[model samples]
Target chain A: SSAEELLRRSREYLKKVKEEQERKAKEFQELLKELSERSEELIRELEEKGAASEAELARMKQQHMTAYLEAQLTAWEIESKSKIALLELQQNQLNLELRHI
Target chain B: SSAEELLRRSREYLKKVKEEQERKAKEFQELLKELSERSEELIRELEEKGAASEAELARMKQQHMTAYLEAQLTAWEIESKSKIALLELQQNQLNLELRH
Candidate 1:
């Protein structure tokens, strides 16, 4: 009973990973939307303020881009970590089942 | 500060993998010792029983051999999985540091 239970547990863990990725993807979209609005607002505000300093735009753009890239990289790390755990669990289940057969 | 913290944590995790492997190796040795003793006992018992279990000796040997090989395979699987995770984590730490 426990053997079959492990196999089922492994299967469900895989499904859970996919759902987790979907949730992460949704969060990414929300973050981008907010970041996008803030970036546009910054430009509009600067434009109305008579473009006091040209360096500010460049600085803001670079900072936002860094934030964007960092977020993407972090996302990969999270997803990869989850995939690794799922694979490890799957291997455990297989190892247990192989003992009998 | 947190960035350095992650780097330190990753290093610790790698050390942990080594320690984990050492523990597993000890367990395997203990298991083999017990299995070896039990197998010898089985054969000795059969010998004192007038050697009527010619088939049983072969069966027992085959069973123990299977158990031994299966254990080896499982150990390899576990070590390989840990190595894979370590590599992935190392990459993650590198990626994070590179952004700086």
Candidate 2:
């Protein structure tokens, strides 16, 4: 049953990757939402008080958006590729175990 | 026998591995080059004071990702070699069994 066992484990690893991918996506989405809302609120509050120009607020918003996007692309690259490497490892592991038995 | 079948499949896997490894390594190298080129384009834009285009936007992020990929590939290569070593060890063990 070594073959069976290896395939079972492979399936488990596949599930984990999908689950983790989703969790990562959820985290990034939250970060984006939080940034968007917080930035707007802060800008509005500033406007109500001493006040700020539209240009300044726009720049601030742009900076915030840029930062978040940078984070997202970076995460996607690293996490996705790392998962690929892990799959490779798992594939070889399964193959080797299948052979060993 | 089922054992005979297992050995046959194992032999098939072994025959295919050489080309598969080459193909994978080639793909990795190609992607890494693309990543490097794109990273540099963004870096140049920042230096040149251009717009915050995706090239500029993705530079730092791409660099981070590229770094992780390099490390990941290194680790994967080491791990694959280790697996191959174990396979060799098993073959040797079988040889000894045959002798005894």
Candidate 3:
């Protein structure tokens, strides 16, 4: 009788675990999707701004290009760092989900 | 007898759950710490670059300040967006850990 009860209890526990894992998997997937969309949006903004900067730089006089260009370049550098960070975070999230498997 | 067995099994399950939760909590905390450090570094880089940009902008003639200022403003805007995103992610992480 005890053995049968133990088996039932174990099965129930396993079922609960499975259900929880599935929920977590779905939640994590949604988060990943949201992050991917955010990343894309950021990249698009960066590209648009970069294009505008280049256009303005091209229009500027040679002497003025130095200061204006430096500003634009610094802006690009910052966004580039953010892009790397986002990619790293995405990889981490993927790894976390994998670890649950 | 079955009651005792059930209690023992339940206790074991609870122990495992607690242990796993503690492990996850630690992992999440480490991630938060890493992200915070990264954020601080980014802010530092932004400030340094901003300062440099300002210095360069200052040396230019008055007539050139308009275009130069616009470029500097654009740079600040991008970095500010990044700062906001990082903060939001950090908050989300905190919420995730809290949900656990």
Best TM-score among the predictions, by candidate number: 1
Ranking by TM-score: 1, 2, 3
True contacts kept of each: 0.03, 0.00, 0.03
As a whole number from 0 to 100, the lDDT of residue A28 in candidate 2 is 74
lDDT of 2 by residue, B1-100 (tens): 5645544554554445445545555555554566455545545545466445555346555644666565456646544664465466446435533433
Best by lDDT: 1
lDDT of 2 by residue, A1-101 (tens): 86777667876877687678768767876877787688768867975774654434434544554454445445544554554455455445545554564
The better candidate by TM-score, 1 or 2, is 1
Q: Which ranges in model 2 have alpha carbons more than 4 Å from their true place?
A: A47-50, A97-101, B1-100
Residue-wise C-alpha lDDT for candidate 1, range A1-101, written one tens digit per residue: 77668667766876787678768867976887797679768877885785734434433443454344345434534544555565445444434444432
Enumerate the chain B TM-scores of all models. Answer: 0.68, 0.50, 0.46
Candidates' lDDT values, in order?
Answer: 0.56, 0.55, 0.45
lDDT for position A40 in model 1: 67
Q: Count clashes in each candidate, considering only residues at least 3 apart in sequence or on different chains.
A: 0, 0, 0
Candidate 3: list runs displaced more than 4 Å.
A1-21, A33-41, A44-101, B51-100
lDDT of 3 by residue, A1-101 (tens): 56556555655665665566556555754765576557556645755677434323322323233433443345344433544354335434423432332
